[PDB]
Design an enzyme around this catalytic site. Sequence first.
Site, PDB file in Angstrom:
ATOM      1  N   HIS A   5     -28.010  53.712 -28.108  1.00 53.32           N
ATOM      2  CA  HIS A   5     -26.769  53.271 -27.696  1.00 53.32           C
ATOM      3  C   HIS A   5     -25.506  53.551 -28.553  1.00 53.32           C
ATOM      4  O   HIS A   5     -24.272  53.623 -27.759  1.00 53.32           O
ATOM      5  CB  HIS A   5     -26.896  51.643 -27.554  1.00 53.32           C
ATOM      6  N   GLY A  30     -22.865  43.071 -30.999  1.00 52.60           N
ATOM      7  CA  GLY A  30     -22.967  43.435 -32.381  1.00 52.60           C
ATOM      8  C   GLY A  30     -24.540  43.339 -33.013  1.00 52.60           C
ATOM      9  O   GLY A  30     -24.758  43.870 -33.863  1.00 52.60           O
ATOM     10  N   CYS A  74     -27.313  44.645 -31.703  1.00 59.90           N
ATOM     11  CA  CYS A  74     -27.942  46.000 -31.231  1.00 59.90           C
ATOM     12  C   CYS A  74     -28.524  46.589 -32.533  1.00 59.90           C
ATOM     13  O   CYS A  74     -27.934  46.655 -33.741  1.00 59.90           O
ATOM     14  CB  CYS A  74     -26.964  47.083 -30.708  1.00 59.90           C
TER      15      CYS A  74
HETATM   16  C1  LIG Z   1     -27.631  48.094 -28.316  1.00 53.39           C
HETATM   17  O1  LIG Z   1     -28.409  48.807 -28.946  1.00 53.39           O
HETATM   18  C2  LIG Z   1     -27.540  48.475 -26.870  1.00 53.39           C
HETATM   19  C3  LIG Z   1     -28.731  49.058 -26.353  1.00 53.39           C
HETATM   20  C4  LIG Z   1     -29.075  48.979 -25.010  1.00 53.39           C
HETATM   21  C5  LIG Z   1     -28.097  48.441 -24.016  1.00 53.39           C
HETATM   22  O2  LIG Z   1     -28.274  48.826 -22.651  1.00 53.39           O
HETATM   23  C6  LIG Z   1     -27.523  48.352 -21.805  1.00 53.39           C
HETATM   24  C7  LIG Z   1     -26.341  49.236 -21.625  1.00 53.39           C
HETATM   25  C8  LIG Z   1     -24.927  49.059 -20.927  1.00 53.39           C
HETATM   26  C9  LIG Z   1     -24.126  49.793 -20.635  1.00 53.39           C
HETATM   27  C10 LIG Z   1     -24.233  51.025 -21.246  1.00 53.39           C
HETATM   28  C11 LIG Z   1     -25.377  51.431 -22.104  1.00 53.39           C
HETATM   29  C12 LIG Z   1     -26.380  50.421 -22.117  1.00 53.39           C
HETATM   30  C13 LIG Z   1     -27.112  47.783 -24.541  1.00 53.39           C
HETATM   31  C14 LIG Z   1     -27.007  47.675 -25.913  1.00 53.39           C
HETATM   32  F1  LIG Z   1     -25.923  46.918 -26.417  1.00 53.39           F
END
Ligand SMILES: *C(=O)c1ccc(OCc2ccccc2)cc1F
EC number: 3.4.19.12
Lengths: 295, 295
Positions: A41, A138, A140
């Site tokens: 991400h 935050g 993630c």
């Molecule tokens: C954090 O690491 C993370 C990973 C995956 C995510 O998936 C949902 C998403 C939404 C919009 C764009 C890309 C991914 C969201 C995260 F915060």
Amino acid sequence: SGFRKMAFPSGKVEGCMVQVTCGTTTLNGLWLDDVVYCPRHVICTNPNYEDLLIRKSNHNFLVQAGNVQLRVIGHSMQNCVLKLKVDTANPKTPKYKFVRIQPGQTFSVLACYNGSPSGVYQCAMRPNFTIKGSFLNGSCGSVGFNIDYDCVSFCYMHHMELPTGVHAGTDLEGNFYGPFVDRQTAQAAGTDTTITVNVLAWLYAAVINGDRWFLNRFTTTLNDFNLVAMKYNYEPLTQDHVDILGPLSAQTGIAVLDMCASLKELLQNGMNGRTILGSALLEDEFTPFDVVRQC
Amino acid sequence: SGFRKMAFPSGKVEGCMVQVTCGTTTLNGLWLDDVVYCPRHVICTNPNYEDLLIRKSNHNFLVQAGNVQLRVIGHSMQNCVLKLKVDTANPKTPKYKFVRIQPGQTFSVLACYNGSPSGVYQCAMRPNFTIKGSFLNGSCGSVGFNIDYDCVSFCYMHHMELPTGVHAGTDLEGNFYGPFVDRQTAQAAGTDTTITVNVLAWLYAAVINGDRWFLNRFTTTLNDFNLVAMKYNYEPLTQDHVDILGPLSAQTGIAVLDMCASLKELLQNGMNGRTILGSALLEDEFTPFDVVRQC
Ligand SMILES: *C(=O)c1ccc(OCc2ccccc2)cc1F
Ligand SMILES: *C(=O)c1ccc(OCc2ccccc2)cc1F
Ligand SMILES: [Br-]
Ligand SMILES: [Mg+2]
Ligand SMILES: [Mg+2]
């Protein structure tokens, strides 16, 4: 005596958490040996991550281990995670493994923000491959783990929150738990069930702790119990589950099928205002191992 | 989103735990700077600890920091703890304070055995000065703590388990929480009450997380609420408690006395089979600070 939601000590994992920034996106990474693992991400802005990563250079990745910047000398994608090779091996790297857990298993979560650990708590992988975590913007890249002796078994990296407030993530090889994808869709958690073997382990914990009001003289059959479990949205109980509960059955002198009869009664009548181990509902996020470890 | 019993990361405290043996008695100690703190229970065999300590020499104390033995060069008793001066300052000593907490406050417990941390969990000091911990034989000397920024505020050292399965201990100055003594008597926990301000903080946490079914249009008076609280064995709510709940009242737009009316209804009618934040009972071991920290 006593029974609590107990996490593993987080020290060994705290020493591995770093901050990863690419563009205006910052999240947490896991620094083991000369590799930093983080969610792919971080290169976002139906994305195509293979394209996004080709368009990136090692210098686009700012990796900060506290007050020290790490130099990225190589990057690659493993499924939904990124592997960022750095010129410095983590001197605090513990003995570790990457393990994928099964629904019904538990693990400790170290919630982190900007590479800084904030708290630690116990979680279970639900039958529908979500976790009921506690995560804010935050988080993630926060990791879940267990410890066996000195070895940290990493089993979860946090990615996203689903509409119902539950959480979805991957193992450390970047493969998602459950049918979830790292992009914006209407994806939602499937219907969940109760982890029966865990409820029984928790009942044994209560007995070991002097809570016995729910016990009865009866014993049931594995068949007759599963017929009742299915009605109440409980997972089926298998002979392997019975064998796993063996040690607890011995310590307490209550046969598993004897305890199953107590559980059947609790499902059919409720608790009548009483509580078990301080709970007014049947708790299913303690495994048999968790009980033995604590009792 | 999400709400969990969340402990502080234990790393900073793990680096301070050591093993202390005197005779055939072994328990845990806390190694900060050149001092090791442990329960004076370690010199036991209506004891008179002043006599027992006079009859002891520095060489009678075996202190082991993992695989390294520490040399005790001085010993003294501070109330119910022992201070063992050692020839080596702990290189892992964090910035720290010794603080005594109030009933209703929470803290993280690092349960330890033979100087080795085993697990971490959140606890509250009950109104009757006990804690509902999880401790087995050998847990003497385990510590409870909070973290503010980089500073570890130690607030509890574990001593004993009372007949009802609850636990009693001291602050790090060796003064017991509550009317308990470190000797064998028929001492028992007094009658406990529910920490009202915490239940309200937890209700705010539920609202912040989208659980609103318990809210109502009504508002009560502080007087009329306390009249109902006392009936149900709840602590009195003070204007200071209302002011402390201020920030949560603002974030949610629900006045404290408005939430108190919801609590009154829950006390008088129950939950009717529903749950709040995954609980079928009113949880009172989250402080207002704990909620803000996590939400
Ligand atoms: C954090 O690491 C993370 C990973 C995956 C995510 O998936 C949902 C998403 C939404 C919009 C764009 C890309 C991914 C969201 C995260 F915060
Ligand atoms: C452990 O540190 C500890 C401290 C105090 C205790 O008090 C009860 C007791 C019982 C018998 C003799 C002395 C003290 C017990 C402990 F385990
Ligand atoms: Br409950
Ligand atoms: Mg039975
Ligand atoms: Mg109201």
